[PDB]
Design an enzyme around this catalytic site. Structure first.
Site, mmCIF file in Angstrom:
data_model
loop_
_atom_site.group_PDB
_atom_site.id
_atom_site.type_symbol
_atom_site.label_atom_id
_atom_site.label_comp_id
_atom_site.label_asym_id
_atom_site.label_seq_id
_atom_site.Cartn_x
_atom_site.Cartn_y
_atom_site.Cartn_z
ATOM 1 N N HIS A 10 0.706 -1.281 0.000
ATOM 2 C CA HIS A 10 0.000 0.000 0.000
ATOM 3 C C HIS A 10 0.735 1.335 0.000
ATOM 4 C CE1 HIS A 10 -3.679 -2.288 0.517
ATOM 5 N NE2 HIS A 10 -3.093 -2.960 1.492
ATOM 6 N N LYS A 35 -6.666 -9.400 -7.614
ATOM 7 C CA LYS A 35 -7.430 -8.681 -6.604
ATOM 8 C C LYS A 35 -8.382 -7.668 -7.224
ATOM 9 C CE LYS A 35 -6.402 -6.399 -2.195
ATOM 10 N NZ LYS A 35 -5.273 -5.787 -1.432
ATOM 11 N N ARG A 36 -9.558 -7.511 -6.630
ATOM 12 C CA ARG A 36 -10.539 -6.577 -7.162
ATOM 13 C C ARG A 36 -10.147 -5.121 -6.942
ATOM 14 N NH1 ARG A 36 -13.711 -5.423 -3.909
ATOM 15 N NH2 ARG A 36 -15.190 -3.674 -4.062
ATOM 16 N N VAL A 37 -9.600 -4.814 -5.774
ATOM 17 C CA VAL A 37 -9.218 -3.440 -5.495
ATOM 18 C C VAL A 37 -8.012 -3.344 -4.561
ATOM 19 C CG1 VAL A 37 -10.919 -3.387 -3.640
ATOM 20 C CG2 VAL A 37 -9.991 -1.255 -4.502
ATOM 21 N N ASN A 38 -7.216 -2.298 -4.743
ATOM 22 C CA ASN A 38 -6.073 -2.053 -3.874
ATOM 23 C C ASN A 38 -5.830 -0.559 -3.840
ATOM 24 O OD1 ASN A 38 -3.725 -3.370 -2.307
ATOM 25 N ND2 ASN A 38 -2.698 -1.815 -3.543
ATOM 26 N N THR A 39 -5.844 -0.003 -2.637
ATOM 27 C CA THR A 39 -5.621 1.420 -2.451
ATOM 28 C C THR A 39 -4.175 1.700 -2.075
ATOM 29 O OG1 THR A 39 -7.904 1.826 -1.734
ATOM 30 C CG2 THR A 39 -6.248 3.468 -1.098
ATOM 31 N N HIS A 103 -3.691 -4.568 7.594
ATOM 32 C CA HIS A 103 -4.651 -4.721 6.503
ATOM 33 C C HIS A 103 -5.340 -3.394 6.243
ATOM 34 C CE1 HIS A 103 -4.365 -9.006 5.980
ATOM 35 N NE2 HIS A 103 -4.566 -9.221 7.269
#
Length: 111
Positions: A10, A35-39, A103
């Site tokens: 991240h 993965k669908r999303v990662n910020t 997380h």
């Protein structure tokens, strides 16, 4: 799962990124699928770690806003998958474990 991995997943140093290429990494392939999303948080590691000071086991919403860039999967296809970028300045919710962010839980508020 731990501080070292959270940092790798991240924390970055620049808001200008190509979501399609940065997400093409084994660390984002969960259960065999992209993965669908990662910020991504554009900040010094120290500032993010500070959100968990004194917290042993709990999701905490940051008091301050962070610069963010989120990569969202546009469609489930064979690796590498396509992602779209979205930048913003908002609070972040992280899972704190023994005073360490482990997380990413959400943007703006905690689940």
């Amino acid at each position: 799962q731990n501080w070292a991995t959270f940092q790798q997943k991240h924390i970055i140093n620049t808001p200008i990124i190509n979501c399609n290429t940065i997400m093409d990494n084994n660390i984002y392939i969960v259960g065999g699928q992209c993965k669908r999303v990662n910020t991504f948080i554009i900040s010094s590691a120290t500032t993010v770690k500070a959100i968990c000071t004194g917290v042993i086991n709990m999701n905490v919403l940051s008091t301050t806003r962070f610069q963010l860039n989120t990569c969202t999967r546009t469609s489930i296809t064979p690796r590498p998958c396509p992602y779209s970028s979205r930048t913003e300045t908002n609070y972040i919710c992280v899972k704190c474990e023994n005073q360490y962010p482990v997380h990413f839980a959400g943007i703006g508020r905690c689940p």
